[PDB]
Amino acid sequence: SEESQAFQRQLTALIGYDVTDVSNVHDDELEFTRRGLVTPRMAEVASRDPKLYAMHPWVTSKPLPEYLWKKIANNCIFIVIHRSTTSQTIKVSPDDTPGAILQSFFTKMAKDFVLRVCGRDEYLVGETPIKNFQWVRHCLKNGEEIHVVLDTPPDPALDEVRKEECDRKFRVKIRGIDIPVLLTVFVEANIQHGQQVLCQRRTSPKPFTEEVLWNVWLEFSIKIKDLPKGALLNLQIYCLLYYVNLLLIDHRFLLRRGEYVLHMWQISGFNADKLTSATNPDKENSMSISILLDNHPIARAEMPNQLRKQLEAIIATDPLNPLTAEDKELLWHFRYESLKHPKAYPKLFSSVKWGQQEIVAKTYQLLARREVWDQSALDVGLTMQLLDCNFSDENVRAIAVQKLESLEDDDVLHYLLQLVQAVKFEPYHDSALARFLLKRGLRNKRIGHFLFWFLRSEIAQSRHYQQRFAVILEAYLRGCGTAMLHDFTQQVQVIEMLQKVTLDIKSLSSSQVISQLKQKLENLQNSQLPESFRVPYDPGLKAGALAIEKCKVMASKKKPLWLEFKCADPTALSNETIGIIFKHGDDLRQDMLILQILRIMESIWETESLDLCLLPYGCISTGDKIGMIEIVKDATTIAKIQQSTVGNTGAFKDEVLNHWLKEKSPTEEKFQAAVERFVYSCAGYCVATFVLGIGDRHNDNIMITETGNLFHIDFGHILGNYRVPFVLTPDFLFVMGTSGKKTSPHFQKFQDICVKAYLALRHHTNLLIILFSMMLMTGMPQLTSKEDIEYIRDALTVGKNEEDAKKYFLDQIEVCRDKGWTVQFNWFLHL
Ligand SMILES: CC(=O)Nc1cn2cc(/C=C3\SC(=O)NC3=O)ccc2n1
């Protein structure tokens, strides 16, 4: 159809990639995947509750934290209900449902409707106690009043979805290599499964010219019979300069046949990019390799005491502890005992000889008896280990996804970014993981909003994964509904225009620069910029017109744009603007990953009734070295506080921060609350930052709210171009009533909090190791090694008892006290 063609054009603009373009493909896998994803999409669409989908309530099944219960008076929660120019306060029980609150309202005021958060598209609806709404917990945590408006539920009609419409050994011939413009060169051909090399062959070395020919059959030791599903033929050019991969068994279970001309990826003169089955779209300047294939469908005891102790010891070790040949042999030999231990699963499946058909068969038999795994309690860390680069088997990965099905929405949000990144480790485009993400996104608008942005971030800048991610995004967009499609259209339009202004102002650069920014912004406000758009990092908020007067260029070497918008919602309780920073020059995909780990650390701390007052601000990567950042209100740089007496001259003073805090507090009650908040937030960042190895920062990259909340910024800056374990300078110590080498009640509180927080993190060692490992593999190329990944295991002091771990961290605090201002001074000189 022609309007079908118009609909596809609309999707193409939202995706930032054309899924119907068949020029960078040597098979129909992506087209097969598009068709394959129709069923799961349609099944999820057919399953959803129109009213609940439209209202997307944001809820949790987790207990109300101890620190939140203490904020509730006499089992009473106050809710202010608005109707027009007047409002009405109502007392409520924490166990009260919004339905019961609504009937409580009509009763109190007598002599079809829905509760919506004032100024936000957030609804307090469904069969859930109010204490279980995320917004209520947000308000309870931050000392804010819960303000609601009584309004009409959104019409589910707005979410309408458009009507859909061999015993021979394996061998490969290396014909030659070609590159248009330019040593000795050879080609290495590996058969890989789960990052491990099953077999390797190489060509003879030849002079490196624009065309190099071999016409050689490379015969492997592996029989065609033994090639596992998901095995890659990895082809590399050494002088490592270039690489490319080819799936040996295709998406239809057929062995690859015939002629291939593969455009290779160049190494920037391990990482997830090195695993891609995509070929380089640049046919003009890339190196190509020409190959030929020619060769089909797919083919009780009792452990003794000591051996059991040995096996149990292997299972107890961390995910990074290497398995010896003996360890693997024990795991495999006593696999029926290993199966009784869910924690053994990653080690056991690493003991599988994936290049032996009979062994893979024995593994499939083993997993048919999955009673222990199925009955076991969901362990996200354990599940995530089975979805990394180490596992290429469909069945193994699928049992990990099976376990994820039990996660509630709030938990899917906590792990969404890293589950999207895990799609990079999947051998085929259509996978259980990709289907899982599609379903959870279509089931919940909040998950779907973030899935859009996370996918779009990779489609905009990854040539390695854009094709796979674009087919997943199209599948989601074909089921989200028209209201969501309209919303995304507006967001994309705004961000594309603001990205233009960001780069334009970047080319220039003063009073001249600010004048030019304001002229470019009026021009946008004139005939391009739509009336409003949902804030990508906070979709409950809608931004309206630019407040031109408040817009400026930041005084940094990356001269980012500081933009302010009016809120588009009339029901908002304040005339406070929405502040957004637009920056070019840093890879914000790295900031996204750090900020998500910080949120995970906060959830861990919550499990142990600890609130460390972190501030993981909104951040979204929109394209190559470009994106948006949430401006935290009433915040200033530690360096700026130092600068405002004395300079500009590295002359750091101890009392300045405490002075600033006192100046910003309207009363002494508020000042004491600010000092308490500083102690907790300083503790939170010292612990978090140390564990992630990002602790040693210049003061210019640490901020504080007038309310005493410390927080680190600019994570991509350090991770892009990567002594003291963390920042605990004499100014921070003075706020805590400490100087030099003495102690105080606040500093003792700080040390106690640090230890508790550090020990709480250590209870989730394996989860933090997997998350850290995946972050480096998918987000920070050039920070791989195994040595880099091992940092977190040293920081988390694995193999130490709690008392030794406590001493270790207290010693780290002392290192900071010994160094004083020395490190900050060297950061200042390194100008
Ligand atoms: C009031 C105020 O200044 N708030 C504020 C500033 N701010 C900055 C960031 C992060 C940045 S700025 C830069 O160049 N790079 C970054 O990563 C985050 C929050 C925030 N709030």
Swiss-Prot record:
Enzyme class per UniProt: transferase
UniProt keywords, alphabetically: Angiogenesis, ATP-binding, Cell membrane, Chemotaxis, Cytoplasm, Disease variant, Endocytosis, Immunity, Inflammatory response, Kinase, Lipid metabolism, Membrane, Nucleotide-binding, Phosphoprotein, Serine/threonine-protein kinase, Transferase
Ranges for domain PIK helical: 300-479
Annotated segments matching region Catalytic loop: 693-701
Positions with a binding annotation for ATP: 579-588, 614-622, 711-719
Stated family: Belongs to the PI3/PI4-kinase family.
Protein name: Phosphatidylinositol 4,5-bisphosphate 3-kinase catalytic subunit gamma isoform
Organism expressing this protein natively: Homo sapiens (Human)
Lineage summary: Eukaryota, Metazoa, Chordata, Craniata, Vertebrata
